[PDB]
Amino acid sequence: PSQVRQNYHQDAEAAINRQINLELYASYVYLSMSCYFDRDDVALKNFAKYFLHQSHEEREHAEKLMKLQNQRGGRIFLQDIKKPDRDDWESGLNAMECALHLEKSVNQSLLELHKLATDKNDPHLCDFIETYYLSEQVKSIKELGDHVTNLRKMGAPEAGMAEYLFDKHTLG
Amino acid sequence: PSQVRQNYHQDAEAAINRQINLELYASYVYLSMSCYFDRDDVALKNFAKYFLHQSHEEREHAEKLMKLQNQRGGRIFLQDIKKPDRDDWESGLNAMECALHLEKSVNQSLLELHKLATDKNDPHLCDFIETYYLSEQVKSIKELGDHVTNLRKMGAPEAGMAEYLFDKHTLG
Amino acid sequence: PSQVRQNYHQDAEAAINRQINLELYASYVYLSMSCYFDRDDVALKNFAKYFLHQSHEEREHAEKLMKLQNQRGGRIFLQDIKKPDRDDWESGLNAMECALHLEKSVNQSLLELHKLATDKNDPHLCDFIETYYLSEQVKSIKELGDHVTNLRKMGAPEAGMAEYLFDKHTLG
Amino acid sequence: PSQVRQNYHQDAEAAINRQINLELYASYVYLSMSCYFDRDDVALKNFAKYFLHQSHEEREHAEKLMKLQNQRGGRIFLQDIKKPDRDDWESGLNAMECALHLEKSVNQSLLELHKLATDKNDPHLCDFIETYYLSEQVKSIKELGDHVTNLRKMGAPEAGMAEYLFDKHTLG
Ligand SMILES: [Fe+3]
Ligand SMILES: [Zn+2]
Ligand SMILES: [Zn+2]
Ligand SMILES: [Zn+2]
Ligand SMILES: [Zn+2]
Numbered sequence: 001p002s003q004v005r006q007n008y009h010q011d012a013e014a015a016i017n018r019q020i021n022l023e024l025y026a027s028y029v030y031l032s033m034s035c036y037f038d039r040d041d042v043a044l045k046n047f048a049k050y051f052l053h054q055s056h057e058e059r060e061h062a063e064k065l066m067k068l069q070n071q072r073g074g075r076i077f078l079q080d081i082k083k084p085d086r087d088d089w090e091s092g093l094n095a096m097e098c099a100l101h102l103e104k105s106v107n108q109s110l111l112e113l114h115k116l117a118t119d120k121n122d123p124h125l126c127d128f129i130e131t132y133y134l135s136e137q138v139k140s141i142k143e144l145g146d147h148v149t150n151l152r153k154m155g156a157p158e159a160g161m162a163e164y165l166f167d168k169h170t171l172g
Numbered sequence: 173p174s175q176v177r178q179n180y181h182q183d184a185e186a187a188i189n190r191q192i193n194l195e196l197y198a199s200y201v202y203l204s205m206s207c208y209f210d211r212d213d214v215a216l217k218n219f220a221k222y223f224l225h226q227s228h229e230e231r232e233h234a235e236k237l238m239k240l241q242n243q244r245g246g247r248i249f250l251q252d253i254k255k256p257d258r259d260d261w262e263s264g265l266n267a268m269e270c271a272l273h274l275e276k277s278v279n280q281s282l283l284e285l286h287k288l289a290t291d292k293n294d295p296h297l298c299d300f301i302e303t304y305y306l307s308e309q310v311k312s313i314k315e316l317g318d319h320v321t322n323l324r325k326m327g328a329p330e331a332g333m334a335e336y337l338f339d340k341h342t343l344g
Numbered sequence: 345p346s347q348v349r350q351n352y353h354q355d356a357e358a359a360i361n362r363q364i365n366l367e368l369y370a371s372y373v374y375l376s377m378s379c380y381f382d383r384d385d386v387a388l389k390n391f392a393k394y395f396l397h398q399s400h401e402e403r404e405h406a407e408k409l410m411k412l413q414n415q416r417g418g419r420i421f422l423q424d425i426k427k428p429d430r431d432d433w434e435s436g437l438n439a440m441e442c443a444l445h446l447e448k449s450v451n452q453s454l455l456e457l458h459k460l461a462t463d464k465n466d467p468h469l470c471d472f473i474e475t476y477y478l479s480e481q482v483k484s485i486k487e488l489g490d491h492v493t494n495l496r497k498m499g500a501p502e503a504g505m506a507e508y509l510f511d512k513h514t515l516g
Numbered sequence: 517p518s519q520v521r522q523n524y525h526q527d528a529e530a531a532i533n534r535q536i537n538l539e540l541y542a543s544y545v546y547l548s549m550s551c552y553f554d555r556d557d558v559a560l561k562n563f564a565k566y567f568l569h570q571s572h573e574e575r576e577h578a579e580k581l582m583k584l585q586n587q588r589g590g591r592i593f594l595q596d597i598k599k600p601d602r603d604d605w606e607s608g609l610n611a612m613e614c615a616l617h618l619e620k621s622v623n624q625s626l627l628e629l630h631k632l633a634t635d636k637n638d639p640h641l642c643d644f645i646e647t648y649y650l651s652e653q654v655k656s657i658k659e660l661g662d663h664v665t666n667l668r669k670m671g672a673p674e675a676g677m678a679e680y681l682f683d684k685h686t687l688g
Contacts, residue, residue, distance in 0.1 A: 104350055111351055114467045130471035138468055142415050145348040146215035153215075155332045162333065169340045176384045176661040178620055179627055196372075196425075203407075204422055210414040212348045224407075231403070235375075235396075242382040243658050250376055253368075253425040295630045296654055299646035387662035387669075504671045505678065512685045 005073030009120040013074035015113050016065055021079045022109050023062035026102055030055035032084040033095050044163060046171035047092050054099070061133070068128060091157035092166065093148065100144040107137040177245030181292040185246035187285050188237055193251045194281050195234035198274055202227035204256040205267050216335060218343035219264050226271070233305070240300060263329035264338065265320065272316040279309040349417030353464040357418035359457050360409055365423045366453050367406035370446055374399035376428040377439050388507060390515035391436050398443070405477070412472060435501035436510065437492065444488040451481040521589030525636040529590035531629050532581055537595045538625050539578035542618055546571035548600040549611050560679060562687035563608050570615070577649070584644060607673035608682065609664065616660040623653040 030051045037048035069076050089095040110133050117125040150170065154162035202223045209220035241248050261267040282305050289297040322342065326334035374395045381392035413420050433439040454477050461469040494514065498506035546567045553564035585592050605611040626649050633641040666686065670678035 100347065107350055111465075111467065115465060118467075126467070127471075130467055134468045134471065138415055141348050141350070142212055145212040145346075146217075148347065149213055149215040150336060153332045154336055159332065165333065165337070169337075174384055174661075175616065175664065176657050178623055178657070200368075200422070200425070203410075204420075207410050207414065207420045207422075210411065211419070212346055212414065212417060238375075238379050239382065242379065242384065243654055245384060247383070247431070248376075248379045249431055250372070250379075250427050252427050253372070255422050255424050259419070259421055293627075293631060295627065295634075295642070295646055296650045299643075299650065384658055384661040385665055387665040389662075504669045504675065505681065508666060508670055509681070509685075 002073030004071075007122055007124070008072040008074060009122065012113075012117055012120055012122055012125060013069065013072075015116055016069050016074065017077050017079075019109060019113055020062050020065045020069070020076065021081070022106055023058050023065060024081045026106055027055045027058035027062065028081055029084040029102055030058060030099070032087065033089055033099070036087070036089045036095070037092075044092060044167045046167040047095065047163070050171050051095070051099070061136075064132060068125075072125070092163040093151040093156040096144055096147045096151060100141065100148060103137060103141050103144055107134070107141060110134060110137060174245030176243075179294055179296070180244040180246060181294065184285075184289055184292055184294055184297060185241065185244075187288055188241050188246065189249050189251075191281060191285055192234050192237045192241070192248065193253070194278055195230050195237060196253045198278055199227045199230035199234065200253055201256040201274055202230060202271070204259065205261055205271070208259070208261045208267070209264075216264060216339045218339040219267065219335070222343050223267070223271070233308075236304060240297075244297070264335040265323040265328040268316055268319045268323060272313065272320060275309060275313050275316055279306070279313060282306060282309060346417030348415075351466055351468070352416040352418060353466065356457075356461055356464055356466055356469060357413065357416075359460055360413050360418065361421050361423075363453060363457055364406050364409045364413070364420065365425070366450055367402050367409060368425045370450055371399045371402035371406065372425055373428040373446055374402060374443070376431065377433055377443070380431070380433045380439070381436075388436060388511045390511040391439065391507070394515050395439070395443070405480075408476060412469075416469070436507040437495040437500040440488055440491045440495060444485065444492060447481060447485050447488055451478070451485060454478060454481060518589030520587075523638055523640070524588040524590060525638065528629075528633055528636055528638055528641060529585065529588075531632055532585050532590065533593050533595075535625060535629055536578050536581045536585070536592065537597070538622055539574050539581060540597045542622055543571045543574035543578065544597055545600040545618055546574060546615070548603065549605055549615070552603070552605045552611070553608075560608060560683045562683040563611065563679070566687050567611070567615070577652075580648060584641075588641070608679040609667040609672040612660055612663045612667060616657065616664060619653060619657050619660055623650070623657060626650060626653060 034048050034050075034052035034055060036042060037044045037051065066076055089098065110129055114126055114129050114134070117129065147166075147170065151162060151166055154166060156162035156166070206220050206222075206224035206227060208214060209216045209223065238248055261270065282301055286298055286301050286306070289301065319338075319342065323334060323338055326338060328334035328338070378392050378394075378396035378399060380386060381388045381395065410420055433442065454473055458470055458473050458478070461473065491510075491514065495506060495510055498510060500506035500510070550564050550566075550568035550571060552558060553560045553567065582592055605614065626645055630642055630645050630650070633645065663682075663686065667678060667682055670682060672678035672682070
C-alpha cells in the first residue's frame with residue numbers, strides 16, 4: 001500500500017486507467033481528423049486547426065488523470081492506443097458528427113466513473129471529475145452539436161460553399 | 173396627495189403603470205427569443221445576443237418609467253408579466269417580424285400615452301415620452317424592418333446560408 | 345431527443361423551468377422593493393440601490409439557468425411572472441425581513457432541485473447547483489440576517505434615525 | 517418690430533419678463549436662507565452651501581431667460597426684486613419646506629408659461645421651457661421632498677442630532 005493512499009479503492013484505480021486510455025484514444029482520433037483536413041484534396045485549414053487543438057486538449061485531460069492517479073497513491077498502467085476507426089472522414093459535417101459521438105461516449109465513461117466513485121464513497125474523486133471533466137464535456141458536446149446544426153442548415157456537404165464559409169466564419 | 177405631486181393626473185399615472193407592464197412584457201418576449209436562438213438545433217449566437225440586448229434595454233425602459241412615476245408623486249402598481257405568445261419562434265426572420273410587430277405595438281401605446289398627456293396639459297410627461305421613448309422606438313422599428321428586408325432578400329428561412337451569413341455580418 | 349441530450353431526465357428539465365420562473369419572480373419582488381424606497385415619502389436611496397442590484401443579480405441567476413437548460417438539450421418553457429405580494433413594504437426592516445424570507449424559499453427550492461438531481465444520478469446538474477447557486481444563497485441569507493439584526497438593534501422602524509444611518513453607513 | 521422677431525407674441529414677452537423676476541426672487545430667497553444657516557446660533561455649514569448653490573442656479577435660470585428674450589427679439593423689462601418673506605427660517609426642516617413651496621410655485625408659473633406658448637402656437641418657446649426648465653424643476657421638487665421626508669423621519673427640528681447628521685451625511 002502506498003504511503004499516501006487513503007480512501008482510494010482498487011476499482012477506482014482501474015477505472016481511472018481505463019479513462020486515461022480513452023482520453024489518449026480521443027486525442028489520436030482528433031489527430032487523424034486534423035490530418036484529413038490538411039490533405040490537398042480537402043484543404044480546410046480551420047477544420048484542421050480545430051481538431052488539432054481538440055487533440056492537444058484531450059492529451060491534457062489524460063495527463064491530468066495521470067497526476068490524479070499518482071496523487072491518490074494508485075499506479076498508472078498504460079495500454080495500447082488503438083488506431084481510429086477510419087482514415088477518411090469524408091467531410092467537415094461527418095467529422096463533426098463523429099466528434100460529437102466520441103465526446104458523448106467519453107462523457108458516458110466519466111458518468112460511469114462518477115457513479116463508481118459515489119458507490120465507493122470517494123468524495124475527492126467525485127469532485128475532481130465534476131470540476132475538471134463533466135462541465136468541459138457538456139460544453140464541448142454543445143459546441144459540436146451547434147457546429148453540426150449550422151453545417152446541416154447551410155447544406156453541407158452537398159452545398160459546395162457551406163464547409164468553406166463555415167471554416168472562415170465560425171472556425172476562423 | 174404626495175407632497176411632490178403637481179399637474180399629474182390619475183389617468184396619466186394609470187397609463188404609466190400600464191406602460192411599465194408593457195415594457196416588462198417586451199423584455200420577457202425578447203428573453204424568450206434569445207433563449208430560442210441558443211438552442212442546439214438553432215445555434216445562432218449573434219441572434220441570441222441581439223435579442224438579449226433588446227431584453228435588457230426594455231428592462232431599462234421600464235425602470236426609467238418607474239423613476240418617472242416616483243419623480244411625479246405617483247405610485248407604481250405592478251401587475252403580472254404575461255408569458256410570451258410562443259416558445260418556438262421558428263426562424264430568425266420570423267423572430268425579427270414578431271419583434272417588429274411588438275415594437276410597433278409598444279410605439280402605439282406610447283403615442284396613446286402622449287395623446288393623453290397632451291389632453292391633460294402635462295408638458296413634462298409629453299417631453300419625457302418624446303425625448304426618451306418615441307425616437308428610440310422609431311430607430312428600433314427602422315432597424316428591425318431593415319433586418320427583415322435583408323433576410324427576406326437573402327432567401328431566409330428556406331435558403332440555408334441566409335440566416336448564418338446574416339448572423340455573421342450584420343449581427344456580428 | 346436533442347442531439348446533445350445525455351443523462352438529463354425530464355423531471356430535472358421541468359424543475360429547472362420552475363426554478364427559472366422562481367428566479368424571475370424574485371427579481372420582480374426586488375424591483376418592487378427598489379421602487380418603494382425611491383418614493384418621495386420613503387426616500388432611502390441606498391435601500392433602493394441595494395434591492396435594484398439584488399433584482400439584477402436574480403435576473404442573471406435566471407439567465408444562467410436558461411443557459412444550463414439549452415446546454416443539456418432541454419427546452420425552456422416560460423410561465424407568467426406573478427406580481428409581488430405587496431406594493432407597500434412599510435419599512436427598511438420589513439423589506440429586509442421579506443427579502444430574507446424570499447431568499448430562504450429560493451434556497452429551499454434549490455435544495456429540492458439538488459435532491460432530485462441526486463436521485464436521478466445527474467452529477468453535472470448537482471455540481472452546477474452547488475457551484476453557482478447554493479453558496480451564493482447562503483451568503484445572501486447571512487447578509488440579510490445581519491442587516492435585520494442591525495436594524496432591529498438600532499430600534500428600526502420606530503427609532504427615526506435608525507433606517508437613515510443604516511442607509512448611509514452599511515448600504516452606502 | 518425687431519429684425520429678428522418672428523412668431524413671438526407680446527403676451528409671451530411679458531410672461532417671460534414676469535418669469536425672469538420670479539427666478540431672481542427665488543435666488544434672493546435662497547440667499548437669505550443661506551445667510552440664516554451661517555449664523556453663529558444655527559451653524560449648519562452644509563445647509564448654507566446647499567441654499568447658496570440653489571441661489572446661484574436660479575440666477576443662471578434668470579440669465580438664460582434673458583438670453584431667450586434677446587434671441588427672440590423681445591425687450592427685457594426688469595422690476596424690483598422683492599425681499600423674502602422672512603429673515604428667520606427657524607430650522608433646516610422649515611427651510612426645506614419653504615423651498616419646496618417656492619419650487620412648486622415657480623413650477624406652476626412655468627406651466628402657465630408653457631400653456632400660453634401653446635395657445636400662441638410658439639413651438640420654440642414651448643420646447644425651450646420643456647428642455648431647460650420643467651425637468652429641472654421636477655428633479656428639484658423631488659429632491660426637496662426627499663430632504664423633508666428624511667428630516668421629519670429623523671425627528672427634526674426637536675431631535676437635536678437630526679439636522680446635524682443630515683447636514684453631514686446627505687448635504688455633506
Ligand atoms: Fe453618524
Ligand atoms: Zn477529455
Ligand atoms: Zn421600450
Ligand atoms: Zn437567485
Ligand atoms: Zn429656476
